[PDB]
């Protein structure tokens, strides 16, 4: 579909080139994005597994960001593709701070009983073990 007799050789080399710390700006697929995630060290943590497959499978970023903002001290390298993460030192203390703020929020908000339950359900964390699984 996208291969022709004028780019097949270039595509093979362009798609197979390996990363080189000495020459990192060498044209490579999604290089700008790869460098952005390397700078953030997201290639060396609990997502390294995904950096050899489809980029649409790296992680559910809408949720990874929602979790990362609820746990400022949670090392970002702990987040997993689905939103889970390796429990961090200040985990127990942050859930505490999140409930207080949540309850205070509900007070100021003129919600409805069904809607109040959801907000409390949204921030539930099941700590099965080394990993913490939210929602």
């Amino acid at each position: 579909p996208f291969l022709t007799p004028d780019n097949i050789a270039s595509s093979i080399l362009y798609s197979t080139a390996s990363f080189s710390r000495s020459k990192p700006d060498r044209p490579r697929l999604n290089l700008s994005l790869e460098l952005k995630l390397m700078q953030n060290e997201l290639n060396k943590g609990q997502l390294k597994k995904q950096f050899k497959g489809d980029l649409r499978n790296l992680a559910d970023w809408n949720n990874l960001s929602l979790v990362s903002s609820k746990f400022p001290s949670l090392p970002i390298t702990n987040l997993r593709p689905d939103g889970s993460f390796l429990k961090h030192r200040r985990f127990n203390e942050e859930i505490a701070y999140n409930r207080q703020t949540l309850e205070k929020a509900i007070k100021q908000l003129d919600l409805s009983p069904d809607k109040v339950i959801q907000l409390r359900e949204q921030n539930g964390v099941a700590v099965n073990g080394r990993v913490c699984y939210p929602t």
Partner: protein, 150 residues
Amino acid sequence: FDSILAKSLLATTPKEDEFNKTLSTINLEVANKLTLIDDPPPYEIIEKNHQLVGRSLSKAVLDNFFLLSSLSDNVRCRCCGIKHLPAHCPLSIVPLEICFLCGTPHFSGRDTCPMLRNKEAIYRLKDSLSKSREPFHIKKQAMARLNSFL
């Protein structure tokens, strides 16, 4: 009371009709003018709101793309580095460049392309490569690259 942190506790990820591939297409072309081959997968993909492209995206296009989601009165998302609406991260709509061998977006490397994990597929590319009109020294260099997988 932490007003900003409250936003994240009340926030819910967007649905299929919000923050979708439509915004990926829009922000891509906006980001491009602030400084493209748009395309329309036999496996499950988590994120479906990525506008796929057939050309490289420079660091400037990509940096501008992420700034378009910038929103005040929000904490710095430590994943993308943008202060954006909670649960609406631009990494989920960033445009992705496809590999012409498999038609899927992945990083360049030796074990990243799904099309180069089966000897039958590599041979088919070797046969195709013989019909290339590209310079010989490139076809030679590419032919070796395929053989290095065998």
